[PDB]
Design a binder for this molecule. Structure first.
Ligand SMILES: CCCCCCCCCO[C@@H]1O[C@H](CO)[C@@H](O)[C@H](O)[C@H]1O
Ligand SMILES: CCCCCCCCCO[C@@H]1O[C@H](CO)[C@@H](O)[C@H](O)[C@H]1O
Ligand SMILES: [Hg+2]
Ligand SMILES: [Hg+2]
Ligand SMILES: [Hg+2]
Ligand SMILES: [Hg+2]
Ligand SMILES: [Mg+2]
Ligand SMILES: [Mg+2]
Lengths: 261, 269
């Protein structure tokens, strides 16, 4: 398990098309999970799952645009649920769950597609891992440093202190990351002023992005999003903070770093 | 009680709207307005709660501006309007199984209503204020012709049992009424100025989508209302029906139309 998860992912950031393939895979998984909490029903799950997985490809390769395939994946989904679900108050339930999967999971995750394209495969790996880096440092400095509850009563506990730490761990992960990456080739990287914010957002977003998921799970009755990968936890669980991050990161990058060819 | 309250609104609705397609910024302001209304309605079915409604309402109304003026991009503000919304519901709603209910309703509002309707923003920009008005009215045009040729030309049920009556026949008619509305629309508009219009091959499809989309777009809304228990989305405008009700098929149309235009007409700026 754990020996390949880290490098398999990374080795994917090589091609734009490789990136797509990873995002696609992750979406079938994460998507399957979030949809399965609303459907234990045979076909239902699968169709909407396929939709959730198609976006990266349609967005990146088919249309060189995002909004166009987003609208039709939604439209195709609702059409389907109208055909299949004949109880109207229920057609609403599947569309609601599919609606969250589409925005939260699918739309938000495929934000790597433009982050990669417009900011170099480099910063892509940077954003992704900076969440892993924040995550560790948030845990450690959280256990031994305080009880200031920012997390809700239903969500797994989180501290202001744990975040201020994970913040710093990202702040540092970048000095290190900068040097190593401007070296290995003349590679594009997060400049020095786009540092403090990029940390701040990986901080604040992963926090909110996980709390939102935990709330999402208390509604479906579980403490795990689902079991797809034999690894520890669920696929949606290993992603949750990353979802809120990517979008906010891409915004932060454009505001503070311009563009590429 | 006067006959000037029901007629004055019937006289301005049509031209007020049209007179807006003049500026890109005017278009934005109409779309913004319509979203606060339509949005207020769809959210209100899930919330009879004081603040809740209003916050998410404002979010749903902001997208057109943020998308058109602030970011010259769509996806960026879409993601943050959602994120700002969920953050809010986490703060306010403390029951997790309920935070899910408001996010679900807000989620449909965002995509269906807000995202779909503001598609006029790019349709206008990339296809000329002309075709914008063309798409919008072509739904009004399809709507009439679908009603008439529907009453007297058939009873083959395409519409669901909870949904207002619809027939394959009524659509094949509204299809044609749009097909024709364009010959007419083309001539008048290539005349009044050297104006950009739906070419002749982009005709058959544009009809087909206004047909098929308004159909699905209304059925989805009707299903949406059966869940909330009403036969009207809400009463905002004193006019007949609700604001969301006058738009429902238009939502599914705009997106699909924009796609269809790009596939078939390039960037006729
Ligand atoms: C397309 C970009 C998105 C990539 C998604 C791949 C998710 C792989 C899971 O990662 C794992 O998540 C844990 C939980 O945080 C970390 O502790 C651990 O070190 C890391 O190996
Ligand atoms: C850019 C969005 C434009 C907003 C359009 C909706 C608000 C105007 C509604 O007016 C009426 O709508 C009814 C719906 O079919 C028809 O009875 C009639 O044709 C039309 O006069
Ligand atoms: Hg790989
Ligand atoms: Hg810089
Ligand atoms: Hg106007
Ligand atoms: Hg033409
Ligand atoms: Mg997490
Ligand atoms: Mg209608």
């Amino acid at each position: 398990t754990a020996s390949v998860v880290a490098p398999f992912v990374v080795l994917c950031f090589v091609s734009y098309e490789s990136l797509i393939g990873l995002v696609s895979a992750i979406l079938i998984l994460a998507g399957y999970e979030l949809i399965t909490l609303e459907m234990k029903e045979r076909d239902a799950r699968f169709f909407y799952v396929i939709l959730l997985a198609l976006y990266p490809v349609l967005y990146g390769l088919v249309f060189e645009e995002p909004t166009q395939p987003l609208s039709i994946l939604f439209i195709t989904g609702v059409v389907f649920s109208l055909i299949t679900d004949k109880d109207p108050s229920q057609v609403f339930k599947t569309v609601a769950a599919f609606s969250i999967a589409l925005i939260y999971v699918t739309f938000f995750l495929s934000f790597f597609l433009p982050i990669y394209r417009d900011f170099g495969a480099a910063n892509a790996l940077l954003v992704l891992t900076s969440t892993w880096v924040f995550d560790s440092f948030a845990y450690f400095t959280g256990l031994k440093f305080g009880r200031t509850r920012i997390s809700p009563r239903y969500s797994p506990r989180k501290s202001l202190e744990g975040v201020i730490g994970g913040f710093l761990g990202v702040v540092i992960y970048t000095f290190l990351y900068r040097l190593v990456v401007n070296d290995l080739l003349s590679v594009n990287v997060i400049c020095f002023r786009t540092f403090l914010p990029f940390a701040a957002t990986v901080a604040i977003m992963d926090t909110f992005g996980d709390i939102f998921e935990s709330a999402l799970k208390r509604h479906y009755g579980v403490k795990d999003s689902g079991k797809t990968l034999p690894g520890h936890g669920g696929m949606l669980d290993r992603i949750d903070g990353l979802l809120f991050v990517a979008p906010v990161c891409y915004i932060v990058f454009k505001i503070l770093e311009g563009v590429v060819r």
